[PDB]
Amino acid sequence: QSALRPVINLTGTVLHTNLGRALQAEAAVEAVAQAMRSPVTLEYHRDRALAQLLCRITGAEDACIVNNNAAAVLLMLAATASGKEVVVSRGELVEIGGAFRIPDVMRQAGCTLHEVGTTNRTHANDYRQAVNENTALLMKVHTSNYSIQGFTKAIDEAELVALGKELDVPVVTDLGSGSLVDLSQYGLPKEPMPQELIAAGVSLVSFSGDKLLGGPQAGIIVGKKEMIARLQSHPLKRALRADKMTLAALEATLRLYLHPEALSEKLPTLRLLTRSAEVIQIQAQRLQAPLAAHYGAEFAVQVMPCLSQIGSGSLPVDRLPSAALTFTPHDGRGSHLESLAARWRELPVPVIGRIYDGRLWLDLRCLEDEQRFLEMLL
Amino acid sequence: QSALRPVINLTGTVLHTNLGRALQAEAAVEAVAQAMRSPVTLEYDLDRGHRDRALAQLLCRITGAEDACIVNNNAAAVLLMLAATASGKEVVVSRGELVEIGGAFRIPDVMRQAGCTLHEVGTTNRTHANDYRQAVNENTALLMKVHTSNYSIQGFTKAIDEAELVALGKELDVPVVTDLGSGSLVDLSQYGLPKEPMPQELIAAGVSLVSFSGDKLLGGPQAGIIVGKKEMIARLQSHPLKRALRADKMTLAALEATLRLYLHPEALSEKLPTLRLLTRSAEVIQIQAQRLVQVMPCLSQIGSGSLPVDRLPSAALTFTLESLAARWRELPVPVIGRIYDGRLWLDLRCLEDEQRFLEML
Amino acid sequence: QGFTKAIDEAELVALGKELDVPVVTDLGSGSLVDLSQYGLPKEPMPQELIAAGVSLVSFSGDKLLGGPQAGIIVGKKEMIARLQSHPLKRALRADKMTLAALEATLRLYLHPEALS
Numbered sequence: 001q002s003a004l005r006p007v008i009n010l011t012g013t014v015l016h017t018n019l020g021r022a023l024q025a026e027a028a029v030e031a032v033a034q035a036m037r038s039p040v041t042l043e044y045h046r047d048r049a050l051a052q053l054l055c056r057i058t059g060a061e062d063a064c065i066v067n068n069n070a071a072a073v074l075l076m077l078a079a080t081a082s083g084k085e086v087v088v089s090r091g092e093l094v095e096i097g098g099a100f101r102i103p104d105v106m107r108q109a110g111c112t113l114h115e116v117g118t119t120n121r122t123h124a125n126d127y128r129q130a131v132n133e134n135t136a137l138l139m140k141v142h143t144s145n146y147s148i149q150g151f152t153k154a155i156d157e158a159e160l161v162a163l164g165k166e167l168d169v170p171v172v173t174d175l176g177s178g179s180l181v182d183l184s185q186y187g188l189p190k191e192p193m194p195q196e197l198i199a200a201g202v203s204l205v206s207f208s209g210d211k212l213l214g215g216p217q218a219g220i221i222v223g224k225k226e227m228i229a230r231l232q233s234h235p236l237k238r239a240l241r242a243d244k245m246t247l248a249a250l251e252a253t254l255r256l257y258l259h260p261e262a263l264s265e266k267l268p269t270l271r272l273l274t275r276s277a278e279v280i281q282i283q284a285q286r287l288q289a290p291l292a293a294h295y296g297a298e299f300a301v302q303v304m305p306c307l308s309q310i311g312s313g314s315l316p317v318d319r320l321p322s323a324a325l326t327f328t329p330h331d332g333r334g335s336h337l338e339s340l341a342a343r344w345r346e347l348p349v350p351v352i353g354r355i356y357d358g359r360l361w362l363d364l365r366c367l368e369d370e371q372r373f374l375e376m377l378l
Numbered sequence: 379q380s381a382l383r384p385v386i387n388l389t390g391t392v393l394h395t396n397l398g399r400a401l402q403a404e405a406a407v408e409a410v411a412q413a414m415r416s417p418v419t420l421e422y423d424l425d426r427g428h429r430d431r432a433l434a435q436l437l438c439r440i441t442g443a444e445d446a447c448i449v450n451n452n453a454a455a456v457l458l459m460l461a462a463t464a465s466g467k468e469v470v471v472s473r474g475e476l477v478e479i480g481g482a483f484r485i486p487d488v489m490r491q492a493g494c495t496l497h498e499v500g501t502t503n504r505t506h507a508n509d510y511r512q513a514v515n516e517n518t519a520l521l522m523k524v525h526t527s528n529y530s531i532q533g534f535t536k537a538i539d540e541a542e543l544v545a546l547g548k549e550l551d552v553p554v555v556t557d558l559g560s561g562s563l564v565d566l567s568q569y570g571l572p573k574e575p576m577p578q579e580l581i582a583a584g585v586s587l588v589s590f591s592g593d594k595l596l597g598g599p600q601a602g603i604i605v606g607k608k609e610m611i612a613r614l615q616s617h618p619l620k621r622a623l624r625a626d627k628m629t630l631a632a633l634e635a636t637l638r639l640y641l642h643p644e645a646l647s648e649k650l651p652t653l654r655l656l657t658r659s660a661e662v663i664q665i666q667a668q669r670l671v672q673v674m675p676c677l678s679q680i681g682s683g684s685l686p687v688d689r690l691p692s693a694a695l696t697f698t699l700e701s702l703a704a705r706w707r708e709l710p711v712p713v714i715g716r717i718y719d720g721r722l723w724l725d726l727r728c729l730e731d732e733q734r735f736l737e738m739l
Numbered sequence: 740q741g742f743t744k745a746i747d748e749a750e751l752v753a754l755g756k757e758l759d760v761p762v763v764t765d766l767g768s769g770s771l772v773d774l775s776q777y778g779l780p781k782e783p784m785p786q787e788l789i790a791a792g793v794s795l796v797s798f799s800g801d802k803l804l805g806g807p808q809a810g811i812i813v814g815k816k817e818m819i820a821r822l823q824s825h826p827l828k829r830a831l832r833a834d835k836m837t838l839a840a841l842e843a844t845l846r847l848y849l850h851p852e853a854l855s
Contacts, residue, residue, distance in 0.1 A: 002409075002432060002634060002638075003419055003423075003431065003432035003634075004409065004413055004418045004419070004420075004432065004627070004630060004631045004634055005418060005419060006412055006413075006415075006416035006417065006418060007416070007417050007418065007419055007422075008416075008417075009417045016417065016422075017421070018419075018420060018421040018422040018426070019417040019418065019419065019420060019422060020413065020417050020418050020420045020627045023414070023415065023416070023417065024414035024415065028414065029411050029414050029415060031380075031382065032410060032411070032414065032628065033407050033410070033411060034384055035382055035398065036401065036402040036406065036407045036410065036599075036632070037401065037402070037407060038384040038385070038386075038401065039384065039385050039386070039387045039394065039397040039398050039401065039728075040382045040383065040384060040385060040397065040398050041381060041382065041383060041385055041396075041397065041712070042382075042396060042397060042398050043395070043396040044385070044396045044397060044714075048381060049380055049381035049382065067450040067454075067622060067623060067624070067626075068622070068624065068626075070621045070622045070624075071450075071622035071623070074619075074622045095742070096742075099620075099621040100621055104618050105618075107618075108618045108619065108622075143741075145741050145742035146740060146741030146742050146743055147740050147741055148740075149740055216626060216628060217626040217627065217628075235487050235488075235490070235491045236457075236491060237482075238453045238482040238483055239450060239451070239453045239454035239457045239491075239623065240450060240454070240622065240623070241450070241451065241453075243450075243451075243599060243600040243626070243628075243629060244382070244398045244600065245410065245599060245600075245626075245628050245629070245632070246626060246628070246629075247382060248382045249414070249628070251380055251381075251382055252380075255380075315740070315741050316741045316742055317740070317741070345424040346424065350419070350424060352422075366417075
């Protein structure tokens with residue numbers, strides 16, 4: 001078995017950054033297989049069908065596609081504000097994962113980071129007082145992995161683009177998550193959409209493709225034709241250009257958003273997120289018997305409510321009811337739990353659970369096919 | 379129909395840069411589909427764990443280097459290598475290796491982007507080891523050898539090989555890096571094809587870092603693979619640029635499945651579509667062309683990573699023009715031929731499925 | 740809330756001791772008792788910061804302390820003496836009713852049983 005081995009994500013995190021983030025749809029898989037097996041018109045520009053599709057969906061003039069959203073932010077800052085100040089709120093200097101920090105990206109991209117306001121309260125006058133002759137951008141970063149609660153104040157995109165129009169300074173956005181549909185319609189927490197930012201007047205909006213979009217690892221920048229053309233002509237773009245499998249997967253995923261009626265079914269990310277809790281309860285009750293019969297004598301397994309995280313691109317707050325299987329040792333020793341976790345991690349198709357509340361939990365929200373999981377766990 | 383539509387490459391260029399370069403094997407396709415459909419341990423080591431440690435071990439087994447690094451493409455590989463190993467310092471490159479690939483990649487421009495200073499030595503055709511020696515000073519960070527994959531200078535020429543430059547850098551305490559580009563992992567001369575420099579030879583000769591593509595003569599996905607010294611690779615992985623240049627899980631899955639084909643070379647000419655199309659015999663092409671408007675000898679270009687000289691016999695069917703090509707480009711599966719010698723030629727070297735192709739025409 | 744990481748006071752004072760740099764804290768609220776005993780959310784205490792090795796801790800007197808508007812800085816004798824001798828201190832010195840209220844309020848914390 002290889003290291004790029006399939007695993008059954010029972011940790012309750014749908015978009016696990018360490019597990020490949022979003023799963024790909026069957027349409028994306030078929031398009032990718034067709035692109036790999038046979039020659040495709042890659043450059044016979046490279047991303048033009050995708051640019052037109054993003055114009056249809058988001059409503060922006062032009063679009064650029066790069067390796068990932070870190071590459072998107074790097075290219076945006078290097079091709080739009082190289083050698084010039086960029087005004088970012090002091091409460092949006094975000095860190096994602098641990099390798100991506102906004103100040104470090106500003107340093108690499110050759111711009112100067114101008115910090116305004118405070119960590120919790122940033123006012124429009126803080127943006128206004130920093131705009132000078134060296135200022136090239138007003139950059140709003142979407143804090144996708146965290147939220148500040150309490151005495152807070154943030155300037156929305158509409159007010160910031162109004163201020164930039166008044167001061168003749170473009171406004172860009174590092175959206176990150178890139179949810180293309182209103183999640184509130186499915187009961188999920190609402191996240192800002194590229195459509196709203198593009199309509200509000202944001203010059204450039206950069207978002208990921210494997211986050212809430214449900215596609216491949218890609219960095220999608222949508223916005224004004226002139227600034228997108230600036231990005232395309234930058235020397236960095238050649239290093240950051242996207243692969244043909246990436247483009248095929250992104251095109252097939254984006255074509256799913258043209259038919260929203262089946263979107264909750266044909267998109268694995270949405271299908272896993274909007275999965276009802278009653279079906280999870282039924283599946284847990286059905287699966288509770290064979291495991292107890294096989295090796296549940298050492299530690300009993302029962303079904304109680306649990307909480308599941310949406311994953312990357314959303315708040316790490318769970319916010320999602322679900323059902324889980326708990327393996328509670330009889331003698332109350334963590335050695336049994338650690339040994340069981342190691343045994344599962346050494347299986348041909350590893351099953352990853354979570355050590356929560358002194359027990360080993362398997363959250364079945366992200367378990368579509370129970371046959372292979374039952375075979376591996378028996 | 380989407381613009382990323384299948385196309386039957388009958389132009390004779392197997393590795394067409396504008397047509398996706400190398401087709402991937404069935405093993406790579408299956409690994410990619412498995413990685414897409416199900417979660418994979420991208421950055422979660424079962425034994426946190428790095429993203430491409432399995433790939434690094436596989437590349438150590440194949441090439442023989444200490445460590446490896448995977449980035450978006452070889453342009454990104456060269457950019458990261460120069461920015462993490464020679465930032466703010468001089469890089470000594472022969473004046474006859476300042477290569478341009480495709481049109482968007484240019485060695486001087488990459489050095490400008492990477493923060494290095496390009497030091498050019500020798501002449502376009504004649505570069506001597508003393509030209510390298512006279513340019514090495516306290517600000518020199520690397521001696522860079524770029525493999526001219528898309529061109530060759532013929533006539534009164536002189537190039538310093540990698541062994542001589544490695545010895546010179548060892549004497550002067552300056553590391554030697556190589557932008558191999560093509561990255562052929564097997565001796566092509568064994569298959570009757572022109573020999574190309576291999577990463578194994580450069581690694582054995584003492585090159586600190588060797589960067590090559592994955593969609594060229596390797597036959598895999600678009601990737602930039604840098605193999606070499608553990609310290610140099612660790613410098614690359616810790617650079618801030620790497621986060622922007624890191625490789626996707628589909629890219630890593632395809633690359634690992636492709637690299638595992640090189641562990642069984644006997645079936646490599648069959649499992650690898652690039653090698654299968656390159657080592658396809660001319661008699662079979664002649665038979666297929668006769669079975670499928672005149673059939674005559676033609677010559678097929680290898681494509682990216684090799685010199686654009688044809689150097690490959692084949693048989694092609696000709697249509698005895700512009701409007702025919704325009705009509706063919708509008709099919710659900712477009713057929714692209716070449717307007718050569720006043721005739722429309724369809725080189726049948728890359729035609730793998732006759733039953734499907736015959737339906738459109 | 741979310742993907743967060745903060746360096747605690749103990750680790751920071753250890754780092755400052757290693758690098759010979761003092762560590763100060765703007766506590767603000769200045770709760771002198773463990774609020775978790777009363778069912779309210781726990782807040783950092785000046786006692787914990789002083790024990791952990793923080794050179795100076797500044798907190799309000801009208802916030803969670805329950806007294807008058809005052810700024811109370813507690814810590815090392817040398818740095819406190821630096822504060823007292825600063826020219827700003829005359830401008831910032833505390834009033835007599837402020838001191839009376841602060842002393843009477845602090846005397847309540849010596850009898851925690853009736854403090855609630």
